[PDB]
Each structure stands twice: as structure tokens, then as C-alpha cells.
């Protein structure tokens with residue numbers, strides 16, 4: 001349908017149309033949207049993949065280290081589950097789930113460029129993850145808008161984590177792929193906790209006006225609840241879990257330069 | 267069927283030897299959709315340097331072009347097919363960088379600041395996938411030497427770092443520099459198309475590589491000329507897109523909606 005041709009291709013700029021373009025939410029992201037069936041992802045579950053050698057273990061310990069610090073300094077531990085402390089948590093952490101896929105895709109892109117080789121579907125998987133995790137941030141920022149101290153520490157988190165993920169991927173892309181493997185193993189846990197808590201009425205949700213950003217992106221009918229929004233986010237994490245564990249494995253076997261297995265499901 | 271059972275499995279390593287190599291998976295599903303007779307009237311344009319930043323973005327490229335042309339010997343003797351492919355192979359390695367760094371920085375910015383990006387990221391990302399497809403195409407028609415393979419490696423480093431700091435310091439300057447580069451690229455890509463029509467250049471690669479035929483939706487009958495003609499249209503989308511984006515920065519509009527995302531929908 002699109003009216004994008006050579007009369008538009010010879011224009012100097014479209015700076016002038018800018019004031020008259022709607023801000024329809026579906027533009028926030030590409031159309032590689034995930035399609036989940038609520039009754040099917042409902043039975044998503046908690047898995048754990050056994051570390052194989054030193055690097056796998058190094059990876060696994062730092063995630064157990066990070067979970068333990070974060071869970072204790074952020075007081076998630078004692079007190080009853082709350083809406084406030086769930087979304088505040090998911091808000092902060094989602095800012096750092098967006099970085100990995102962008103360092104991998106970006107570096108694998110540069111490699112594809114300098115040795116002039118075919119990537120075989122890897123780049124477009126990691127960048128849709130990154131995107132899909134950024135949409136996880138976008139949704140929670142419709143739910144809780146943070147204040148100055150939480151914002152400043154988000155900025156320093158990215159400084160540090162961008163530097164770590166970047167230099168960790170260059171030296172061991174299996175490490176970073178293992179690391180998100182396990183990262184997501186924890187993200188699956190936390191979320192099924194939130195659903196279990198709703199189901200056992202310990203956290204009866206007040207944010208049921210599910211944001212338009214999330215309705216379009218996950219194609220949810222108006223009558224969707226917070227629990228239905230959470231499950232889909234949790235379903236996305238189970239995928240990344242397998243994707244980064246498959247990716248790490250593939251490296252272990254020296255299949256870096258082989259077809260991205262998840263191309264078939266499309 | 268992509269459901270819980272597949273999500274609840276640990277690894278899909280056993281599946282690697284059973285999944286086949288398919289040219290359609292080398293990119294995303296966001297492909298250029300051109301019609302040959304329409305895009306035949308793409309044209310060389312030149313934006314006016316609007317101020318000290320543009321003037322610098324323009325004077326950088328012009329000097330890069332002059333230097334590269336006397337150093338590569340483009341102008342020395344006749345146009346040959348090897349001289350064109352050689353050149354565009356080299357240059358299309360560099361071209362994939364800018365959209366990536368741009369795409370990356372803005373991604374990052376929406377995460378720390380927690381703000382809508384409103385369509386820039388994708389456009390800037392498929393823009394880098396597009397140039398890389400030009401590249402994957404040119405690697406089919408020539409497989410460069412060791413001297414050139416080294417020359418290509420080191421040039422990534424200088425260029426990557428340059429754009430990294432460039433985009434952090436001033437994204438306006440980068441998009442302009444990119445806009446300007448893609449003027450020059452259309453000049454080359456029409457010079458080539460013109461050399462064909464005259465018979466100063468007789469291509470022998472009028473068998474267009476598989477990757478390129480499903481990327482651009484071409485026919486098995488399409489030739490070298492036709493391929494240069496779809497690419498040129500890509501280089502003119504990056505020309506407009508990036509000069510617009512840089513006008514948006516000049517006006518403090520870099521957090522409005524990317525206009526092109528309606529110019530599709």
C-alpha cells in the first residue's frame with residue numbers, strides 16, 4: 001500500500017510533515033510483535049540449565065550474586081508483597097534487560113561487516129529481544145513513574161552494565177549469552193511469584209486499566225487484567241531464556257557462524 | 267505452535283544440524299519494496315549547509331571522497347567492472363556502521379531516561395541491515411584480497427569510534443554527514459548506471475546473486491543494471507531519511523515522532 005517512491009526519494013527533507021503526524025502507540029516498535037495464547041503460556045514454568053564448565057559457572061554465580069544483593073538492598077525480602085514494590089522492581093531491572101541484545105546484535109553486525117560474512121539470522125533475533133525488553137520498560141513506566149534518586153541510579157547502572165556487557169561479549173560471547181540465560185531464569189521465577197500472589201489473593205491488583213502500549217503490542221482485548229499483562233511479559237522471558245541458552249551452547253560447540261535455529265519458527 | 271512447551275525447554279542445540287541455510291533469513295522481514303520503472307528517476311540532490319555543523323559535515327565528506335578517489339585510483343583510466351565492485355565493496359562496509367550506532371544510542375536513551383522513542387530505532391536499525399545487504403550482495407560478485415581484507419578491518423575501528431563519540435557529542439552532525447555521504451553514493455550509483463547505458467561498461471555479473479533476489483523482490487531475468495538500480499534507491503532513502511532526522515535535531519524535534527512511520531501506515 002505505502003506511497004513511498006521516487007518523488008519522495010528526491011525530496012531534500014520531510015521536516016515539514018513532522019507537526020502533522022499522529023502519535024499512535026503501535027509506532028513505538030516494529031511489527032515483529034509476539035503472539036501469545038493466554039491459556040497456553042499460563043503453564044510456562046521454572047527451569048534451570050546446568051552449568052557446564054568454568055565460564056558457565058562464573059556466569060551463574062554472578063547472577064546469583066546480583067539477585068542476592070539486589071533482593072536485600074532493595075528490601076524486596078521482608079514486608080508483604082505489594083503492587084508498589086513489584087512494579088518499582090520490574091521498572092528498574094527492565095532498564096538493564098534491554099542492553100544485552102543491543103551489544104550482541106551490534107557486535108555481530110560489526111563482525112558481519114568486517115570479515116564480510118553472512119550472519120544467518122542472529123542479529124535480528126537479539127535486536128527484537130532488546131526492543132521487546134524496552135517495551136517492558138515502556139509498559140511499567142505507564143504504571144509507575146519514578147522519582148529523582150531511582151532515575152539517577154538507573155543512569156549509573158547503564159554506565160556500568162553497558163561497559164560490562166560490551167567488554168564481556170568481546171572476550172566471551174558465550175559468557176554473556178550464558179549470563180542472560182540465567183538472568184531470565186530469575187526473571188521467570190519473580191514473575192510466576194507475582195501471578196501466584198494474585199491467584200492466592202495476597203496481591204489483589206489495582207492497575208487493571210492495562211496501558212494502550214501493552215494492549216497493541218501483545219494484542220490484548222480490553223478486558224485484560226494485570227495478571228494477564230504479567231503472564232505475557234513472563235512468557236517473553238522464557239523465550240529469551242532458551243534463546244540465550246541455545247546461543248551460549250552453540251558457541252560452546254563452535255557453531256557461532258552457523259544458522260540461528262529460531263529462524264524456522266516464523 | 268510456539269507455546270509453553272517450547273518455552274519450557276532448556277536448549278535447542280539438537281536442532282542446529284536439522285535447520286537449513288536460507289537466504290531469506292540473512293535479514294529481517296523489513297525489505298525494500300521498489301518498482302524498477304518508478305525508481306529509474308531517482309536523482310542527485312544537494313542540501314544547503316544550514317550552519318557551521320552542516321558545513322563541517324559536508325567538508326569532511328568532500329575531503330574523504332577526494333582523498334579516497336585519488337588514493338584508490340577511481341579516476342585513473344577507464345571504468346572497469348572490477349573497479350566499481352572493488353570500490354562499493356570497500357565503502358559498503360563503512361555504510362552499515364552509522365545506522366547501528368545511531369539505532370543503539372537512541373535505544374539506550376529510551377532505557378535510562380524511560381521515554382518513548384516514537385519510531386526512530388527501527389528505521390535506524392533496518393537502515394544498517396540494508397547497507398549490510400548491499401554488502402552481502404557485493405561479496406557474491408568479488409572476494410577481495412588479503413591487502414584489502416586488512417584495510418577493511420582497521421577502517422572499521424577508526425570509523426566506529428569516530429561515530430561513537432560523534433553521535434554522543436552531536437547527533438545532528440552525524441545524520442548530516444550520513445545525509446551527505448548518501449548524496450555522493452547516488453552520484454556513484456548513477457555514474458555506474460550511465461556507464462552501462464553507454465557501453466563504457468559491460469557488466470559480466472548480470473546474474474544477480476540469490477541473497478539479493480529475495481531481498482529486493484527481483485526476477486531471475488534482472489541484471490547488473492537493475493541491481494545497481496534497487497541499491498541506489500536505498501541510498502536515496504538514507505539520503506532523505508537522514509537529512510530529515512538532522513533537520514529535526516536542528517529544530518529540537520529529536521523527541522517528536524519519526525515522520526516516516528506514518529509514511530508507511
Ligand SMILES: C/C(=C\Cc1c(O)c(Cl)c(C)c(C=O)c1O)CC/C=C(\C)[C@H](C)O
Nearest residue numbers: 066067070089090093094097183186187190
Ligand atoms: C534481580 C536479579 C534477578 C531477578 C530478575 C531479573 O534478573 C530480571 Cl532480568 C528481571 C526483569 C526481573 C523482574 O522482576 C527479576 O526479578 C539479578 C540481577 C540483578 C541485577 C542486574 C542488578 C540490578 O544489577
Ligand SMILES: C/C(=C\Cc1c(O)c(Cl)c(C)c(C=O)c1O)CC/C=C(\C)[C@H](C)O
Nearest residue numbers: 330331334353354357360361447450451454
Ligand atoms: C569515497 C567516499 C564517498 C563516496 C561514496 C560513498 O560515500 C558511499 Cl556511502 C558509497 C556507497 C559510494 C559507492 O561506492 C561512494 O562512492 C568517502 C570515503 C570515505 C572513506 C574512505 C572513509 C570511510 O572515511
Ligand SMILES: [Fe+3]
Nearest residue numbers: 097184187237
Ligand atoms: Fe529479561
Ligand SMILES: [Fe+3]
Nearest residue numbers: 094097133136
Ligand atoms: Fe523483560
Ligand SMILES: [Fe+3]
Nearest residue numbers: 358361397400
Ligand atoms: Fe549502501
Ligand SMILES: [Fe+3]
Nearest residue numbers: 361448451501
Ligand atoms: Fe549508503
Ligand SMILES: [O-]
Nearest residue numbers: 094097133187
Ligand atoms: O526482562
Ligand SMILES: [O-]
Nearest residue numbers: 358361397451
Ligand atoms: O552505501
